[PDB]
Design a protein around this motif. Structure first.
Motif, PDB file in Angstrom:
ATOM      1  N   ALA A 181     -18.609 -10.535  15.315  1.00  0.00           N
ATOM      2  CA  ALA A 181     -18.251  -9.283  14.634  1.00  0.00           C
ATOM      3  C   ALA A 181     -18.347  -9.463  13.126  1.00  0.00           C
ATOM      4  O   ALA A 181     -17.919 -10.486  12.606  1.00  0.00           O
ATOM      5  CB  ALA A 181     -16.840  -8.869  15.016  1.00  0.00           C
ATOM      6  N   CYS A 221     -13.023  -7.925  19.152  1.00  0.00           N
ATOM      7  CA  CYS A 221     -12.844  -6.508  18.842  1.00  0.00           C
ATOM      8  C   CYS A 221     -14.081  -5.752  19.398  1.00  0.00           C
ATOM      9  O   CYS A 221     -15.011  -6.406  19.918  1.00  0.00           O
ATOM     10  CB  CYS A 221     -12.688  -6.298  17.339  1.00  0.00           C
ATOM     11  SG  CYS A 221     -14.057  -6.961  16.374  1.00  0.00           S
ATOM     12  N   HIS A 277     -16.692  -4.822  18.172  1.00  0.00           N
ATOM     13  CA  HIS A 277     -17.947  -5.275  17.531  1.00  0.00           C
ATOM     14  C   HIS A 277     -18.400  -6.650  18.064  1.00  0.00           C
ATOM     15  O   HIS A 277     -19.605  -6.943  18.162  1.00  0.00           O
ATOM     16  CB  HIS A 277     -17.775  -5.407  16.011  1.00  0.00           C
ATOM     17  CG  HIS A 277     -16.816  -4.428  15.432  1.00  0.00           C
ATOM     18  ND1 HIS A 277     -15.442  -4.595  15.572  1.00  0.00           N
ATOM     19  CD2 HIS A 277     -17.062  -3.265  14.787  1.00  0.00           C
ATOM     20  CE1 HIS A 277     -14.912  -3.528  15.001  1.00  0.00           C
ATOM     21  NE2 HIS A 277     -15.841  -2.712  14.504  1.00  0.00           N
ATOM     22  N   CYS A 314     -16.984  -7.430  10.271  1.00  0.00           N
ATOM     23  CA  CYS A 314     -16.053  -6.343   9.962  1.00  0.00           C
ATOM     24  C   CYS A 314     -14.745  -6.909   9.356  1.00  0.00           C
ATOM     25  O   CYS A 314     -14.607  -8.122   9.150  1.00  0.00           O
ATOM     26  CB  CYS A 314     -15.753  -5.585  11.255  1.00  0.00           C
ATOM     27  SG  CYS A 314     -14.908  -6.596  12.518  1.00  0.00           S
TER      28      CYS A 314
HETATM   29 ZN   LIG Z   1     -14.153  -5.517  14.247  1.00  0.00          ZN
END
Ligand SMILES: [Zn+2]
Ligand SMILES: NC(=O)[C@H]1CCCN(C(=O)Cc2ccnc(Cl)c2Br)C1
Length: 139
Positions: free
Chosen positions: A48, A110, A112, A50
């Motif tokens: 991920a 998560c 992502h 982010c």
């Molecule tokens: Zn994330």
């Protein structure tokens, strides 16, 4: 136990790295408790990219996945163990939750992808070594 397999990389906690990981070492950081080694076979886990502060992690000592809110990666003090002296571990993210020594390497994800891996525990707080800033892992 536990690892992330992204491309030709294997990401593990450094205190749990094997002889093969060190003979095929790519990058290692004692303050982050991370080691990355090379693999022959291809991996396809998605990292991920982010700044999510919510996710789910696998807790082997309960055979369950738990949804947690965790802190942004930062310098956090860690008590002395058989692997490290007393020190500050960088890029640690904390959540309120259960963990036992054996839970190390359990993945936190998560929507992502992979956020990081279980690295510290106890006192009702579980710590995760972040891997999202390691952009070089995707090429
Ligand atoms: Zn994330
Ligand atoms: N990153 C470190 O310095 C760890 C090395 C191994 C020891 N350590 C711990 O926190 C031990 C621990 C206790 C309960 N739950 C978990 Cl998931 C863990 Br890991 C510290």
């Amino acid at each position: 136990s536990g690892a992330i397999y992204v491309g030709n990389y294997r990401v593990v906690n450094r205190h749990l790295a094997t002889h093969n990981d060190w003979a095929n070492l790519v990058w290692e950081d004692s303050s982050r408790d991370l080691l990355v080694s090379s693999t022959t076979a291809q991996g396809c886990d998605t990292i991920a990219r982010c700044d999510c502060q919510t996710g789910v992690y696998y807790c082997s000592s309960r055979r369950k996945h738990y949804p947690v809110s965790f802190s942004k990666p930062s310098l956090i003090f860690v008590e002395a163990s058989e692997y490290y002296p007393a020190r500050y571990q960088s890029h640690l993210m904390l959540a309120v939750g259960h963990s036992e020594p054996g839970d190390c390497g359990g993945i936190l994800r998560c929507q992502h992808g992979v956020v990081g891996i279980v690295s510290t525990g106890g006192n009702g707080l579980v710590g995760f070594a972040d891997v999202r800033d390691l952009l070089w892992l995707d090429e």
